[PDB]
Design a protein around this ligand. Structure first.
Ligand SMILES: Cc1cc2nc3c(=O)[nH]c(=O)nc-3n(C[C@H](O)[C@H](O)[C@H](O)COP(=O)(O)OP(=O)(O)OC[C@H]3O[C@@H](n4cnc5c(N)ncnc54)[C@H](O)[C@@H]3O)c2cc1C
Ligand SMILES: Cc1cc2nc3c(=O)[nH]c(=O)nc-3n(C[C@H](O)[C@H](O)[C@H](O)COP(=O)(O)OP(=O)(O)OC[C@H]3O[C@@H](n4cnc5c(N)ncnc54)[C@H](O)[C@@H]3O)c2cc1C
Ligand SMILES: O=c1ccn([C@@H]2O[C@H](COP(=O)(O)OP(=O)(O)O)[C@@H](O)[C@H]2O)c(=O)[nH]1
Ligand SMILES: O=c1ccn([C@@H]2O[C@H](COP(=O)(O)OP(=O)(O)O)[C@@H](O)[C@H]2O)c(=O)[nH]1
Lengths: 393, 394
């Protein structure tokens, strides 16, 4: 079919940022090809039929950023609530303040530690390694929170989530979490955050709203690309699906994690009194439980029912959609081969690669969007509007 | 010009300055604000601690919050607000507790996680020890509401320190100030809008007094200057926000108030307690709370190696003390009744209105004081100033 100026594979925040930018800022005709039956990638939301409560289909999505560029951009498509994310950690039958801060320290060690007292305590317990010298997840984690807290709140959660030796996981995984010596327990440390007032799916649909954008759901790129590109040969492609799958796993399989969920409607108005409860112990199969009513107190939610979602992690087999890049040293070697294939495909077939799946990177929503805005301004727009090379100067 | 005052306002706290600003800017009236202290703002006055430069509140820590959008929109004319949300922690038997009482405190104190339903059931059954109807005092009523363990831990001795009044003889609404939750929400206030003034309270207050039609007299006692000022401006009403009993020479007796003492101290550490306010719920320390002011403004560049803290002590307001909180004994409410009659008669004969915390013997938060002043303005003072309407009501 035609006519299109640009193809985008995948309708997550990366793909839709590209589509919206090309359509509105250049007046380009965009075709977005989505294999799932819905838009939005893993950020897709939908109502639970019984309660009418909006659920994040793939587990809680919390938006946060310190990038004002991004904040201004996304506010063109949605309003945000004043929500600030806080997570509690269940360990040995007790709910703990989390992440690292004077709350967690005083609870776990059984009495109040002042900022200076806590700094001294953790410094002793972390002394087996300095943070600068840390070379993997386990080392970095211990260097920041100390061995006792590492063993209680990090080690077993990480084992459930990754089922991978912590000495072979990336150090940057732990630096996602704030590390504090105050009573501050905000899960993020960014300037801006909140939840979309009308929900994620509305926000995503608003990004795809321009008349120059066409979205085709339930369509696999690899089934339709040859005839699509033949009819529109000038159009480049932005691919946001799994990187290894694009090349038919020719350089080996990257390790990914996937998730399963159990959604349950309960006959109580409030199951756990907080949106997300982490379960840090090996004795329960799920990593955390989401209770979505707490994300939108402003809505007309029932007061005698609630929807919760248990989250279970496992390896992405060949049958599964991947959710998390694992990035072991072995993975990173396979990734290097795929990055080489990707750059070749960009030069030859005018296919760009982006997003969590397209680049095998642990990307939050705001980082995917920043990345797409950059790709559009610096690489794609000059190609589309002056015929500049996708192999940039 | 100067003088030819249309309105006298006694006191330059948030109530008085709201009145003065509204009369000036909305009605074009000339206002004289008479203030006995050497600065405006009443107890909300802020200033920098000299050694650290950190902005402190010498008359007590002040946290702004409101659920009234009209009040919010009004105060934002004079200041911007940070995104600060107040949280308080409670020190008991050497441990820091999440506070106010919610799933955090419940889980910490009772030693395991309680779900919303489990916590509701727990509190209900412990509270069942005493029937609220049969409660003979503060202690029994507190127990009948939250149960004996929570009462004996976080309310009993803290209440004893701050009021030194029989808990059975204190207003029930006092505890209503704290939100009560079966969630993990520990945001101290329940109000829609809050934050700290970006340039501090004193700048906010100065902006309220900025209109050229407002003249302010500092270091001036209304009772020293009123006769000749009113003789020169006989038509001008008076909005009095000083002490109600002092106004009438304590003729009906003296109203009971609590006062606070403060000890400001600069410490050679960048962070003393990692949070703005720590309550001390136990009898083994004499102060009720410690404030650490750097945490009121994280957005500012404060010293990395010093901090200013302020210990708070509560006692009876003796004759030379500043009154902070009304005690409201039955003898007090009776004394108040007599003064309320005096006040109404004075409104009728002398065109004096009584307002604010001191003027009405009523504790008032800032947002309450501002709302009260806006209401007085709309219903009583502005129609009087604009149309000659009567100041007499109810
Ligand atoms: C469990 C989970 C929790 C998360 N929580 C947060 C959070 O709290 N805060 C935050 O900021 N971010 C969070 N994220 C990240 C977020 O979901 C996205 O990864 C982020 O928005 C990046 O989007 P993306 O477009 O790069 O990838 P995706 O959202 O995965 O979109 C890629 C799209 O490509 C589609 N696709 C794949 N192959 C094909 C094909 N052959 N043909 C057509 N379409 C194809 C896919 O169906 C998918 O829709 C979470 C992610 C996951 C998995
Ligand atoms: C320790 C303390 C802590 C507080 N903490 C908070 C808080 O966290 N959040 C919040 O919202 N509110 C708080 N408040 C309330 C806050 O101070 C309000 O702004 C205040 O109640 C406003 O009411 P007001 O203007 O009538 O009182 P005031 O602020 O007391 O002003 C009355 C003024 O009248 C002056 N005056 C009295 N007699 C005379 C006289 N004869 N002649 C001339 N002038 C006179 C006084 O000097 C004073 O300046 C606190 C109050 C106190 C005392
Ligand atoms: O209670 C927790 C939370 C996080 N993590 C570790 O920190 C990483 C990042 O945590 P995040 O909360 O960012 O994970 P996501 O929500 O992206 O799955 C996890 O993969 C774990 O390895 C942990 O060990 N315990
Ligand atoms: O840890 C606390 C905090 C408050 N209160 C009671 O609740 C009242 C209201 O507390 P607030 O924090 O509102 O007091 P303020 O800041 O006005 O002095 C206090 O007077 C006490 O009687 C208590 O018993 N324990």
């Amino acid at each position: 079919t035609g006519n299109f100026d640009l193809f985008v594979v995948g309708s997550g925040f990366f793909g839709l940022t590209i589509a919206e930018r090309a359509a509105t800022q250049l007046g380009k005709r965009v075709l977005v090809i989505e294999r799932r039956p819905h838009i939005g990638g893993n950020a897709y939301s939908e109502p639970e039929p019984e309660t009418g409560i909006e659920v994040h289909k793939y587990g809680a999505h919390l938006f946060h950023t310190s990038n004002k560029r991004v904040w201004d951009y996304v506010r063109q498509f949605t309003d945000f609530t004043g929500y600030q994310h806080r997570v509690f950690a269940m360990h040995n039958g007790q709910a703990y303040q989390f992440p690292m801060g004077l709350g967690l320290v005083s609870q776990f060690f059984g009495r109040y530690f002042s900022p200076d007292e806590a700094r001294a305590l953790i410094a002793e317990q972390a002394s087996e390694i300095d943070t600068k010298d840390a070379k993997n997840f386990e080392e970095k984690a211990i260097s920041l929170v100390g061995r006792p807290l590492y063993e209680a709140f990090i080690k077993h959660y990480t084992a459930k989530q990754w089922q991978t030796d912590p000495k072979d996981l990336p150090a940057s995984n732990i630096t996602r979490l704030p590390v504090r010596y105050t009573f501050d327990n905000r899960y993020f440390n960014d300037t801006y955050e909140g939840l979309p007032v009308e929900g994620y799916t509305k926000w995503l649909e608003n990004m795809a709203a321009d008349e120059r954008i066409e979205v085709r759901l339930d369509t696999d790129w690899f089934d339709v690309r040859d005839d699509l590109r033949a009819a529109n040969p000038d159009a480049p492609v932005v691919y946001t699906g799994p990187l290894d799958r694009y090349f038919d796993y020719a350089e080996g399989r990257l390790g990914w994690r996937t998730l399963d969920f159990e959604l349950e409607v309960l006959e109580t108005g409030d199951f756990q009194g907080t949106p997300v409860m982490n379960y840090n112990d090996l004795d329960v199969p799920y990593t955390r439980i989401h209770e979505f009513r707490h994300f939108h107190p402003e809505r007309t939610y029932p007061t005698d029912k609630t929807v919760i979602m248990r989250e279970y992690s496992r390896f992405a087999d060949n049958d599964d959609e991947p959710y998390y890049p694992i990035n072991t040293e072995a993975d990173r070697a396979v990734l290097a081969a795929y990055r080489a294939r990707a750059k070749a495909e960009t030069a030859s077939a005018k296919v760009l690669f982006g997003g969590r799946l397209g680049t095998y990177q642990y990307l939050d929503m705001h980082m995917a969007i920043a990345s797409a805005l950059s790709m559009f301004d610096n690489v794609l727009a000059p190609h589309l509007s002056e015929g500049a090379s996708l192999v940039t100067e």
